[PDB]
């Protein structure tokens, strides 16, 4: 794979495909990218930071199981009595399988950064005129093991989320689609923006995707990393219509079920794209890119 040569400078094996320790070099660029993204934040945007886990009931309510049940990581634990736990530990001691004593907690590993913001917004009552904007980030998890450096199981996501009338969200997404392309250009990256679909699970899912692409509810900024024929989506621009507004009873300034949308930056994919494009020697990066990143 074309990205493989980057591994030695960027990552250390943690004994599991798609789960890597990050070197100081790699993390310094993730951090500069995060700061660059922050510097483009629209005024009036509330910044929240989420932990890597969230409420299972909240995610269930958001409908994640109808779309990507195969990707979800659930948190489980030994919730039994001391006797039960002791037997589990005893099985392990003998080289047996202690994991049969696991049961699910009330938490999952977050599959996207924006999910927890919808109930938070809803608890504040009706939206002001012009809607609400959030800046959120989380370490996310998706159960898709791969050896490719651009397909991780645990990865950082940063999102700007808009909640408001259809016009609010639509204007928001157009601003960000232009703005994201300008950022990518300033970073010296090669890309195109195209219609896309989320990878819905199963038969019905395949038709959800067609309909998603047809309605143009999702654009991606695609960067050629392993090939020009199969580029890597490093950002997405998502329009959810009234799905979350209805789900969470959020109503806009006009008494209608709010529309929502988000712009998502895959922080590890952008960093990997930067190293693939510019190499692992920062002093050699183009001067305009170094300046843009404050290097």
């Amino acid at each position: 794979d074309p990205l493989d040569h980057l591994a030695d400078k960027l990552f250390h094996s943690m004994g599991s495909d798609g789960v890597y320790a990050r070197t100081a070099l790699y993390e310094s660029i993730v951090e500069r990218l995060a700061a660059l993204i922050t510097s483009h934040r629209e005024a009036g945007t509330e910044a929240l930071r989420f932990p890597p886990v969230m409420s299972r009931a909240q995610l269930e309510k958001s409908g994640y199981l109808k779309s990507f049940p195969n990707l979800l990581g659930c948190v489980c634990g030994l919730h039994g009595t001391e006797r039960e736990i002791n037997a589990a530990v005893s099985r392990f001691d003998a080289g047996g399988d202690w994991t049969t004593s696991l049961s699910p907690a009330d938490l999952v590993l977050s599959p996207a950064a924006c999910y927890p913001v919808y109930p938070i917004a809803a608890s504040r009552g009706p939206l002001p005129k012009g809607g609400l904007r959030f800046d959120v980030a989380a370490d996310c998890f998706r159960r898709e093991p791969s050896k490719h450096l651009d397909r991780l199981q645990s990865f950082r996501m940063r999102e700007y989320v808009c909640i408001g009338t259809p016009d609010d969200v639509s204007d928001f997404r157009e601003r960000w689609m232009v703005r994201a392309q300008a950022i990518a250009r300033d970073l010296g990256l090669t890309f195109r923006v195209d219609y896309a679909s989320d990878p819905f699970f199963g038969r019905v899912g395949q038709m959800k995707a067609v309909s998603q692409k047809q309605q143009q509810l999702k654009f991606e900024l695609l960067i050629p990393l392993r090939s020009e024929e199969q580029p890597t989506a490093c950002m997405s621009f998502n329009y959810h219509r009234e799905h979350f507004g209805t789900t969470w009873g959020i109503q806009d300034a006009n008494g209608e079920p709010a529309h929502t949308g988000c712009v998502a930056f895959g922080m590890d994919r952008l960093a990997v794209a930067m190293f693939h494009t510019h190499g692992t020697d920062l002093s050699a990066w183009p001067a305009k890119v170094r300046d843009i990143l404050g290097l």
């Binding site: 038969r203 019905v204 395949q206 038709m207 959800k208 067609v210 309909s211 998603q212 692409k213 047809q214 309605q215």
Partner: protein, 38 residues
Amino acid sequence: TPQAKLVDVGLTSMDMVNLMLGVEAEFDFTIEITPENF
């Protein structure tokens, strides 16, 4: 119209879901499904 794009008339995702389902109710159709043929 039998030329009008399916999504233009107002068939969103859940509509298209039942549309794949409805076309099953007619014939041997078990449809996998691709963007072009819709």
